[model samples]
Target: PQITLWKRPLVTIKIGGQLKEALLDTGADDTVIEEMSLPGRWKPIMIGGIGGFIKVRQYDQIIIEIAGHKAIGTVLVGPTPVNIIGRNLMTQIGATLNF
Candidate 1:
């Protein structure tokens, strides 16, 4: 589906059967989500953002449902301002920016 930049491209996504809203950010290299308890073990990894690098929990092999489409990849759990579905999952879902 083609989306307009007139507003933030927010979409509903399902993670581990949990429904949540998130943004589809093409600029972001990785999927960053708010602090939430996810299954499996995660390793501490530092990731750089606008201000500086911050530590985040890296969870792998996590499945995410985006607008009925399903994708699997690494999900970074941290104190992010908002939930973001980055290019990593977008690539698998075949999501792209169109003018």
Candidate 2:
């Protein structure tokens, strides 16, 4: 589907059986969730971003539903400024920038 870019391309999504709102950030390469509790051991790691690196927990094989489209991949649950839906899941739902 075609999506328009604005100040923030936000969308409602379901992850780990919970409904939440997230930003569809084209500049980001990975999906990130601010708060979550999923079963399974996630590896702790640090990722570098615009300013500095932040600690995160990466959970693999996560399923997320966006606009009724299902996307399966890794999800990073951590202290994010906001929940973000990045390119990893964007392409799965056939989302393209309509800029």
Candidate 3:
């Protein structure tokens, strides 16, 4: 089933057993959130985007929910301006490029 994109495709996401609002950014390569606590030990890495490259911690066990559907994938932790859901996790909920 196709999950309709909301205003910026904003939806509820669960990470580290917590709820947060995030935008579904198909343009993004991976999920990113700045507000949630680190799920576990993460490797320090650099990520590039609209802004210059920034260092971030990468967590691979994040679970996000849309209505009742859920998906698990990598989530980056750092000084991100907003929460975004990318293709990495989007596929799990059957909402990828062809959804």
Candidate 4:
């Protein structure tokens, strides 16, 4: 008989005062949020990309959780057609991927 287990990193955030979970990725450099899903109080900010400086918004501090640990940080609120959990939380948790 054999026993196998699998695990992945997930971070939770408070959006519009709502707690939500997001997967973690180390390759991303900045925090991203869904423009339509973000809170109304978030303020728009300018962000630069390969295309050009794109406009993104800033939101209040978000409570990030991972492996029973927690950290608080500001998140960039913007439109993400594909939502992602980036290096912001990955680095903090010192994560690694295995296959």
Q: Model 3, stretches more than 4 Å misplaced?
A: 1-6, 97-99
Q: Stretches of candidate 1 above 4 Å error?
A: none
Among all windows of ten consecutive residues in candidate 4, which has the lowest summed lDDT? 1-10
RMSD (Cα, Å) for all candidates, in order, is 0.8, 1.5, 2.4, 5.5
Q: Estimate each model's TM-score.
A: 0.95, 0.90, 0.82, 0.56
Clashing pairs for model 2 are: none
Clashes of 2: 0
Model 4 misses residue 46 by how many Å? Answer: 2.7
Query: Tens digits of per-residue lDDT for model 3 on 5-97?
Result: 544667787777777888888888887788557647678888899868988888877566754677767788888899887788877777755
lDDT of model 4, residue 61:
62
**Rank order (by TM-score, best first):** 1, 2, 3, 4
Task: Show where candidate 4 strays beyond 4 Å.
Answer: 1-23, 36-43, 48-53, 66-69, 97-99
CA lDDT of each candidate? 0.91, 0.86, 0.76, 0.59
lDDT of 4 at 63: 67
CA lDDT of 95 in candidate 3? 78
Write the candidate numbers in order of decreasing lDDT: 1, 2, 3, 4
* TM-score-superior candidate, 2 or 3: 2
lDDT per residue, candidate 1, 1-99, as tens digits? 888888999999998788999999988999999998789779999988799998899999999998889899999999889999999999999987765
Which one is best on lDDT?
A: 1
